[PDB]
C-alpha cells in the first residue's frame, strides 16, 4: 500500500530527473544560467543552496531505507550529482559537511566529493586546494567517528595521488603532518589510512619530506613489532601490507636516507607473515635496484646471525637467500673485492647452518645448494690478490 | 564491514601504483624454498612497464570521453544564452 506508493513516487522523481532538447534537460538549464553573465548572482546562490538540500534529501532516504526502492534512489542520486558542474558542486556541498549533523550523511557526502574528482583533470586544481583545506580542517572534529575519520583520509590520499604535485606546498606539508600524528591512533583503520597518506605525500614531496623522516620510519618499525603480537586483528593482512608498501614507497624516493635504517626494512620484509611472498619478494627487488649493494651485503650478515639463523622460519630463510643471490649477481667487481671479508664471514656462517638448523635434510641440502652457487659467483668477480689471503 | 572494504581499497590502490604486477588483496619445506627462489626470477622477467601503460590508457580514455561531454554540453547551452540574448 504505502510502500507501493513510495516505490512509484521515486519512479516519478526518477522520470523527471532522468536525462532522456535544451528546454527539457534540467542539467542544461542549470549550466546556461551559469553561462549567462546577466543572470543575477543571488539567483546563482539559490541554485547552489537548493541543490545541497536536494542532495541531502536523497541521501537521507538512501541512508534510512525494499531492494527495488534502494536501487531507484541510486538512479535518482546519480541524476542529482550531474545537475551542476564540479566547480559549483564543491561550493554547494563542502559547507554542508559542517552543517550536517548525521554521521551517515557526512559519510556519504565525503564519498561523492571524491567521486567527482575521479574523471577530472588539471582544470580542477584551484578547486582541489579548497577541498583539501576543508578536509584537513574537519579531521580534528571527526576524530570521534572511525568510519568518517577513515574516509576523509582515503579521499585525501586519492587527491594527493592524482595531481598531487600541482597542489600548493602548504597543503602537502600540512597533510603529511596530520598523517604522522594519526599513525598512533588506536584503531587499525586509521593506521592503514595514515600509512597510505604518508606514502603518497612522501612520493610527491620526495627529499623535502626528510624533515618528517624521524616521524615516519621509526614509528612504523615499532608498529610492525606490535603487528606480530596481535595476530587476532581482522585487519592484520592489510596492516602488514600497508607498512610494507610504506617502505616500498620510500625505497624508491629517498634511497640514500634509508640506507641507515635498511636493516629494519629487511626485518619487516622477512618476518611479515601475513603478506604474500610475491609482495615481499617484489619489495626486495626495489632494494637491490635502488640502494647501494655494499650496504645490503654488510647488513645481510648482521641480520642472518641475529635473527634468520635461529628463526627456524622457512619463508624468512628463502627470502634471505633471494636477497643474497640478487646482491651478488648485481654487485660490481670493485665493490665485490672491497666487501669480500664480510661476505666470507657470512659464508662460514651459512656453511655452519647445518649444525643449528631445525629443518630436515632435504631443506638444508637445498639451502646449501644455493649457498654454493652464490659463493662461486662471488669468488669469481675477484682477483688473486684479494682472494689469496681469504682462501 | 565498511571498515574492511575501505582498508582493502586503500591498500589495493597503493599496490597498483607501486607494484603493478603483484596480486591484490581479497608440505615439504624444501619445496617451499625452491618456489620462492623460482618466483624471484619470474617476477624479474615480468613486463610491469606494459601493465602501467594499459592502466594509463584506460583512465585516459574515460577522462577524454568525459571532457568531450563537458565541451559538447557547453556549446549547446552557449547557443541558448545567445538565442535568448537576441530576443
Amino acid at each position: 500500500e504505502f510502500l507501493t506508493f513510495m516505490n512509484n513516487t521515486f519512479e516519478f522523481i526518477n522520470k523527471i530527473t532522468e536525462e532522456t532538447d535544451v528546454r527539457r534537460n534540467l542539467r542544461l538549464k542549470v549550466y546556461s544560467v551559469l553561462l549567462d553573465e546577466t543572470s543575477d548572482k543571488k539567483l546563482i546562490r539559490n541554485i547552489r543552496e537548493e541543490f545541497g538540500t536536494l542532495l541531502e534529501g536523497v541521501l537521507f532516504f538512501i541512508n534510512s531505507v525494499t531492494t527495488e526502492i534502494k536501487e531507484i534512489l541510486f538512479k535518482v542520486l546519480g541524476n542529482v550529482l550531474q545537475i551542476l558542474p564540479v566547480d559549483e558542486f564543491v561550493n554547494a556541498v563542502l559547507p554542508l559537511l559542517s552543517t550536517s549533523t548525521n554521521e551517515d550523511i557526512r559519510y556519504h557526502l565525503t564519498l561523492v566529493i571524491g567521486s567527482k574528482f575521479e574523471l577530472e583533470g588539471s582544470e580542477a586544481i584551484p578547486i582541489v586546494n579548497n577541498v583539501m583545506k576543508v578536509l584537513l580542517d574537519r579531521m580534528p572534529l571527526e576524530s570521534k567517528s572511525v568510519v568518517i575519520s577513515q574516509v576523509i583520509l582515503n579521499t585525501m590520499t586519492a587527491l594527493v595521488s592524482k595531481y598531487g604535485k600541482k597542489l600548493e606546498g602548504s597543503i602537502l606539508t600540512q597533510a603529511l603532518t596530520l598523517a604522522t600524528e594519526k599513525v598512533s591512533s588506536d584503531m587499525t583503520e586509521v593506521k592503514i589510512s595514515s600509512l597510505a597518506l604518508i606514502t603518497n605525500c612522501v612520493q610527491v614531496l620526495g627529499v623535502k619530506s626528510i624533515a618528517f623522516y624521524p616521524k615516519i620510519v621509526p614509528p612504523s618499525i615499532k608498529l610492525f613489532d606490535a603487528s606480530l603480537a596481535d595476530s587476532s586483528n581482522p585487519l592484520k593482512e592489510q596492516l602488514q601490507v600497508a607498512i610494507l608498501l610504506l617502505f616500498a614507497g620510500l625505497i624508491k624516493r629517498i634511497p640514500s636516507f634509508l640506507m641507515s635504517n635498511i636493516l629494519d626494512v629487511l626485518h619487516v620484509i622477512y618476518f611479515s607473515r601475513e603478506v604474500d611472498s610475491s609482495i615481499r619478494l617484489s619489495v626486495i627487488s626495489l632494494i637491490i635496484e635502488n640502494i647501494d649493494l655494499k650496504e645490503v651485503l654488510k647488513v645481510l650478515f648482521r641480520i642472518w646471525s641475529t635473527e634468520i639463523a635461529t628463526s627456524n622460519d622457512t619463508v624468512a630463510v628463502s627470502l634471505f637467500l633471494s636477497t643474497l643471490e640478487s646482491t651478488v649477481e648485481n654487485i660490481d667487481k670493485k665493490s665485490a673485492t672491497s666487501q669480500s671479508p664480510i661476505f666470507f664471514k657470512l659464508l662460514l656462517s651459512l656453511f655452519e647452518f647445518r649444525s643449528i638448523s631445525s629443518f630436515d635434510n632435504n631443506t638444508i641440502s637445498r639451502i646449501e645448494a644455493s649457498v654454493h652457487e652464490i659463493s662461486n659467483s662471488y669468488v669469481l668477480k675477484m682477483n688473486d690478490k684479494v682472494f689469496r689471503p681469504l682462501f | 564491514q565498511t571498515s574492511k572494504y575501505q582498508a582493502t581499497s586503500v591498500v589495493n590502490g597503493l599496490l597498483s601504483n607501486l607494484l603493478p604486477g603483484v596480486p591484490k588483496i581479497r608440505g615439504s619445506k624444501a619445496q617451499l624454498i625452491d618456489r620462492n627462489l623460482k618466483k624471484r626470477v619470474q617476477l624479474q622477467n615480468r613486463d610491469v612497464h606494459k601493465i602501467k601503460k594499459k592502466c594509463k590508457l584506460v583512465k585516459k580514455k574515460k577522462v577524454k570521453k568525459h571532457k568531450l561531454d563537458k565541451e559538447q554540453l557547453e556549446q549547446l547551452a552557449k547557443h541558448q544564452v545567445l538565442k535568448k540574448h537576441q530576443h
Binding site: 538512501i62 541510486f74 546519480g78 551517515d104 556519504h108 564519498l111 567521486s115 | 564491514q1 565498511t2
Partner: peptide, 24 residues
Amino acid sequence: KKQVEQRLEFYLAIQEAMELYNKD
C-alpha cells in the same frame, strides 16, 4: 527438418560502499 534445426542453433563505485554501511 529437425536435422536442419540442430544446425541452426549450432550456428557506481560509491554505490557498493553505501549498502555495506547500512549492513554495518
